[PDB]
Ligand binder design. Structure first.
Ligand SMILES: Cc1cc2nc3c(=O)[nH]c(=O)nc-3n(C[C@H](O)[C@H](O)[C@H](O)COP(=O)(O)OP(=O)(O)OC[C@H]3O[C@@H](n4cnc5c(N)ncnc54)[C@H](O)[C@@H]3O)c2cc1C
Ligand code: SF4
Ligand code: SF4
Ligand code: SF4
Ligand code: SF4
Ligand code: SF4
Ligand code: FES
Lengths: 549, 411, 137
């Protein structure tokens, strides 16, 4: 057939979204090659990207559906397994309404599968009990940055920090995780850019920094409060910015004026505090790289120094999962439909109803991952898990196992036989990133294409196909979407932003950044261009008091 | 026609001759070899996307080489290591491969180390005056040329300037001016001196073609009997036209080659003294190499690194988990590669941490060369440590005029 | 506070014999060099020398048989070529190449072994502490 064919794809291992070539010989992925054309990484990959191809053709991959029949799983046909799932979901619905079911996907999955998964969870039985890894993962920082600015995403890109004078890494292992985001720090120091690292431990990304600052762990609020106190005290705040685009300054004033001497809390001497504070406030264009109160303090700093809406500046919280941003965008949260359209507002609730040809959408705040797992027997019973391994990921794994065994009809879709699989009643095999054909979304809001290299191992299918077949079994209208392009077009019709991100535009190696409202718009690589995304269009900066644990 | 002839060559097929960068002779020769069954496949470069994307391609259908026609100056890749990894080193199948000077040198390095079969491989070598990274070319065009890069149709380095053809006209800027401003050819391409691959089987270029054929003929130099046979077969079956080259063309070809040698020497100088001398060079090297995150891209991309397991992976040399890795990691590559480095730049350009691997390695290589007199990538000469000789060892000890190896070795 | 750390890698058949003969003849020299004793100097890999220098050897000495007197017919020609190349690498990484030398000591040259010991110690003392130990940090 084919000998050494190159297929361009996105790396599935973190939020940088590096591009790579998979080498496919006789329908087998046999290696990973650089793609020098990519703007994100210029053909450069970390160890994970270099060896992403190893797990694709493992013998352990699930090949056919499995059904727990009075013990060990026996081999089932697709029709059999799907009819079983449809029957059990139907009965649990008809007995316990929409509260009885529970959905959660992984951030490993492509945008089209996250969107169709949340569409399945809402168009059919109307439940907002949909969620994903981002809760239990490191950062609920999206909510905090949303409160500060309006969009919880990173304000600027990665190439953008090359334009600053004062990259300020803060508590980030940006070279251990996101190494090709830390490549920007390496390039910047080669260009001679002031770099200040502030992690509690001397990490390999703190080696690159001109100044390194220890502080006692769990004291970010105190340290940032001190820095803002000195900025205010010597008046290096940005008056036009604060008076024009920011609100809450008096509250910040009261809250911070109690942090003149905080050496007791954080270990940083007042001399070093003044040094970093004045370097940051004096830098004309300074970018913060972060990795709830902790992220709103960063928003406080950026708003206080007027470092937001411009090239070479901003706040860039690093995500960590390959498609966590994409899942949140597609609307795999309890409270947002898609593109962060809140379900609390009847306006877009009715817009969803009209677009999806369904009635009486829930509007109540769903149950997050831990909410579901804790109430996994009390009112929730019946659970579809799209790619999670909760027994290995959640803390108190034994409690997780107890709750899952308290559960009626778990369904698990995975590419491998995990530990959570033993507790499933049905196991639907899935496809990995080399067999899907969707899109990922980087941490810098960039939509990248994933391309099909090989076929799923045996009888395994990809998630859009599985969910469409299940919805056709259960009699749900609106899941006639045979391709990732059709799923994407349905999503685009639904969402106001991302309306310009057609696949003919995503076939560009550059990709598209998420606020792309029209088809001629080139994208929005820098957010909050001259107005924010809150009610008055003005960022709010809050006063946080440090709580000792 | 016989191993040393210098010819003008263009394709009989008008479409092949249009799509060739010059006369289409590389694409006519490759097509002929494939369809007359000298070779079982053809490894060439095609555009996968915009002309800034160069994708290697194994082609077995003779109908697909018209897609390979044209030269991509943003193709900074290296072919021979892909043939070893995913084509079993050409141990069972004949191939015909289009290659630049660095790609011919890499072929010879891997054949020295027994990793490919040059009896099976046919190397059609192209002249190379330099390659540009695709993304750097984009930034060049956006900033210095003041053009939207997606507008460009074709783009080439001709007469030492960067001609781009966009909608509206064409432009040109001296590559030396660009290279001073911080753009241009890759660093190793600036230092390169393998301009006409005379170690390949055929050397094709646009240098020395003068007069009525200045854009519709390829200057061919027949560098081996295998290439002579390929050319004679193509000319007889009528896929390729041959006229003897013009002596004035040969002369100015020699002059341009010599000038490119001098420019390469100047860049070698300014770069190697830019690295420093004494303990300053050790702080440059050590502080740069402290960035390495052990992605091993430099090892997997180097043509000379053919080892099943690198010694950089052995726990008695490098501690497995310590990430701010030792200088031993790069000392083990200086020791193993620097004697034969072909200055391909792959190690430098695939490094996520932007470490000047190629600059360090070539700075060591140039004077390992002027010490032992071994030029990498030219022929089947075994590596310096794979062939030690009694008389030569006596000679270097006597030349030091000393009873040991301590001093009077360098000037 | 500082004592030179010199490491020697001496072959078994001429340099170890020469050092043993010097000891037997009671030739005194300073106690600064510690030896490793491989069979031939052909065994000495480049990575041994580089590993020593990166661990912090202020000096490295490799001692073997004279040319034409290797126990294994030609194993010290290979070592000589390797050490010439090592001298070149250390000069181009900016470390002082006179921290390394290769001496040819026969089995009967105990006096010459003592003189080699003295001269290596003197040269390293002049050179001073190696820079790697502070460049690491
Ligand atoms: C990056 C680059 C720089 C060059 N610089 C010069 C120069 O300064 N002076 C000069 O006289 N000639 C240069 N050449 C060669 C020049 O294009 C030749 O005149 C041309 O190859 C003649 O062949 P043709 O037009 O007859 O056949 P063509 O139809 O052009 O055949 C060209 C062949 O080269 C292959 N190819 C294309 N891009 C690459 C690449 N990046 N790496 C390897 N193979 C590739 C194509 O697949 C095709 O088989 C350069 C070539 C490249 C690729
Ligand atoms: S930096 Fe992240 S996305 Fe890029 S190759 Fe490494 S793990 Fe994959
Ligand atoms: S290294 Fe030399 S031969 Fe290779 S592309 Fe650069 S200039 Fe051409
Ligand atoms: S490519 Fe660069 S980062 Fe990767 S191992 Fe080599 S030197 Fe280190
Ligand atoms: S060390 Fe780097 S420049 Fe030298 S041959 Fe290997 S890849 Fe090419
Ligand atoms: S560095 Fe040395 S051991 Fe490692 S792959 Fe290259 S040649 Fe082999
Ligand atoms: S036996 Fe001593 S050098 Fe070989």
């Amino acid at each position: 057939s084919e000998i050494m064919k190159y297929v361009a794809t996105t790396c599935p291992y973190c939020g940088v979204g590096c591009t790579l070539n998979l080498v496919v010989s006789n329908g087998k992925v046999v290696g990973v090659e650089p793609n020098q054309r990519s703007p994100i990484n210029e053909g450069k990959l970390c160890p994970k990207g270099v060896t992403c191809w190893e797990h694709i053709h493992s013998p352990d991959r699930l090949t056919t559906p499995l059904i727990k029949k009075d013990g060990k799983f026996i081999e089932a046909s697709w029709d059999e397994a799907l009819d079983l799932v449809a029957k059990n979901l139907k009965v649990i619905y008809d007995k316990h309404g929409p509260k009885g079911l529970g959905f959660q996907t992984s951030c490993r999955t492509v945008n089209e599968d996250c969107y169709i998964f949340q569409k399945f969870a809402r168009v059919g039985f109307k439940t907002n009990n949909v969620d994903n890894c981002a809760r239990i993962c490191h950062g609920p920082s999206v909510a905090g940055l949303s409160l500060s600015f309006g969009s919880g995403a990173a304000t600027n890109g990665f190439e953008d920090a090359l334009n600053a004078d004062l990259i300020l890494i803060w508590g980030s292992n940006a070279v251990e995780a996101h190494p090709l985001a830390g490549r920007r720090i390496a390039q910047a120091k080669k260009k001679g850019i002031q770099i200040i690292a502030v992690d509690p431990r001397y990490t390999m990304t703190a080696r690159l920094a001109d100044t390194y600052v220890r502080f006692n762990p769990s004291t970010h609020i105190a340290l940032a409060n001190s820095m803002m106190y000195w900025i205010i005290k010597e008046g290096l705040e940005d008056k036009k910015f604060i008076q024009d685009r920011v609100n809450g300054f008096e509250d910040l004033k009261k809250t911070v004026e109690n942090y003149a001497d905080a050496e007791a809390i954080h270990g940083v001497p007042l001399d070093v505090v003044k040094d970093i504070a004045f370097r940051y406030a004096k830098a004309k264009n300074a970018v913060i790289i972060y990795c709830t109160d902790n992220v709103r303090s960063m928003g406080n700093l950026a708003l206080l120094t007027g470092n937001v809406g411009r090239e070479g500046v901003g706040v860039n919280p690093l995500r960590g999962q390959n498609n966590v941003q994409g899942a949140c965008d597609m609307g795999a949260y309890p409270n947002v439909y898609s593109g962060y359209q809140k379900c609390e507002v009847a306006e877009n609730r009715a817009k969803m109803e009209k677009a999806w040809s369904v009635t009486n959408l829930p509007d109540w705040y769903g149950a997050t991952l831990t909410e579901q797992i804790n109430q996994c027997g009390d009112e929730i019973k019946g659970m579809y898990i799209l790619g999670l391994n909760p027994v290995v990921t959640y803390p108190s794994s034994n409690h997780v196992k107890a709750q899952l065994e308290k559960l009626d009809f778990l369904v698990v879709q995975d590419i491998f036989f995990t530990e959570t699989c033993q507790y499933a009643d049905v196991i639907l095999p899935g496809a990995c990133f080399a067999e899907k054909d969707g899109t990922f979304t980087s941490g810098e809001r960039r939509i990248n294409r994933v391309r099909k290299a090989v076929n799923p191992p045996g009888q395994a299918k990809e998630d859009i196909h599985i969910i469409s077949e299940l919805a056709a079994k259960m009699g749900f209208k609106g899941f006639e979407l045979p391709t990732a392009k059709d799923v994407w077009d349905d999503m685009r019709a639904v969402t106001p932003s991302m309306f310009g991100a057609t696949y003919e535009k995503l076939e560009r190696p550059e990709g598209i950044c998420w606020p792309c409202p029209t088809e001629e718009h080139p994208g929005t690589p820098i957010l909050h261009r001259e107005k924010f995304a809150t009610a008055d269009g003005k960022g709010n900066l809050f006063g946080i008091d440090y709580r000792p644990p | 026609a016989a191993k040393g002839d210098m010819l003008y060559a263009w394709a009989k097929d008008a479409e092949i001759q249009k799509k060739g960068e010059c006369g289409g002779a590389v694409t006519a020769l490759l097509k002929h070899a494939l369809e007359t069954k000298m070779v079982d496949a053809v490894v060439a470069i095609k555009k996968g996307k915009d002309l800034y994307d160069a994708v290697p391609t194994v082609i077995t259908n003779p109908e697909d080489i018209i897609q390979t026609a044209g030269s991509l100056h943003c193709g900074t890749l290296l072919i021979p290591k892909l043939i070893k990894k995913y084509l079993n080193g050409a141990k069972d199948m004949k191939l015909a491969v289009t290659c630049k000077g660095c790609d011919a040198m890499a072929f010879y390095e891997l054949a020295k180390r027994n990793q490919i079969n040059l009896d099976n491989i046919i190397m059609i070598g192209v002249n190379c005056g330099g390659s540009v990274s695709p993304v750097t070319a984009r930034k060049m065009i956006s900033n210095k040329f003041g053009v939207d890069p997606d507008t460009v149709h074709k783009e080439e380095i001709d007469k030492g300037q960067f001609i781009i053809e966009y909608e509206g006209g064409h432009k040109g800027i001296k590559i030396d001016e660009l290279e001073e401003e911080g753009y241009g050819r890759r660093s190793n391409c600036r230092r390169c001196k393998m301009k006409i691959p005379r170690q390949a089987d055929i050397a094709a270029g646009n240098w020395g073609v003068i007069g009525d054929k200045a854009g519709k003929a390829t200057f061919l130099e027949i560098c081996s009997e295998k290439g002579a046979n390929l050319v004679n077969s193509a000319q007889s079956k009528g896929a390729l036209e041959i006229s003897p080259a013009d002596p004035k063309g040969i002369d100015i070809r020699a002059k341009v080659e010599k000038a490119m040698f001098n420019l390469g020497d100047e860049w070698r100088h300014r770069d190697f003294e830019g690295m420093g001398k004494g303990k300053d060079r050790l702080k440059l090297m050590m502080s740069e190499s402290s960035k390495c995150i052990k992605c091993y891209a430099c090892v997997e991309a180097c043509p000379i690194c053919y080892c099943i397991e690198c010694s950089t992976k052995k726990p008695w040399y490098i501690a497995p988990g310590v990430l701010p890795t030792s200088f031993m990691f790069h000392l083990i590559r200086f020791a193993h590669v620097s004697d034969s480095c072909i200055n391909c730049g792959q190690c430098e350009e695939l490094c996520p941490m932007e470490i000047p691997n190629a600059l360090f390695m070539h700075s060591q290589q140039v004077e390992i060369e002027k010490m032992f007199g071994h030029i990498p990538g030219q022929d089947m000469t075994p590596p310096i440590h794979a062939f030690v000789e009694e008389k030569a060892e006596r000679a270097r000890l006597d030349a030091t005029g000393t009873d040991s190896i301590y001093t009077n070795i360098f000037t | 506070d500082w004592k030179p750390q010199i490491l020697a890698i001496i072959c078994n058949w001429c340099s170890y014999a020469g050092a043993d003969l010097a000891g037997g003849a009671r030739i005194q020299y300073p106690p600064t060099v510690r030896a490793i004793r491989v069979m031939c100097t052909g065994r000495v890999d480049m990575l041994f020398i580089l590993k020593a220098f990166v661990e912090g050897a202020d000096g490295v000495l490799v001692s073997g048989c004279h040319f034409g007197d290797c126990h294994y017919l030609e194993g010290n020609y290979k070592a000589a070529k390797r050490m010439f190349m090592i001298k070149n690498l250390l000069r181009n990484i900016g470390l002082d190449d006179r921290r390394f030398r290769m001496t040819f000591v026969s089995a009967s040259e105990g006096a010459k072994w003592g003189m080699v010991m003295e001269d290596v110690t003197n040269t390293i003392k002049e050179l001073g502490p190696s820079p790697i130990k502070e460049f690491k940090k």
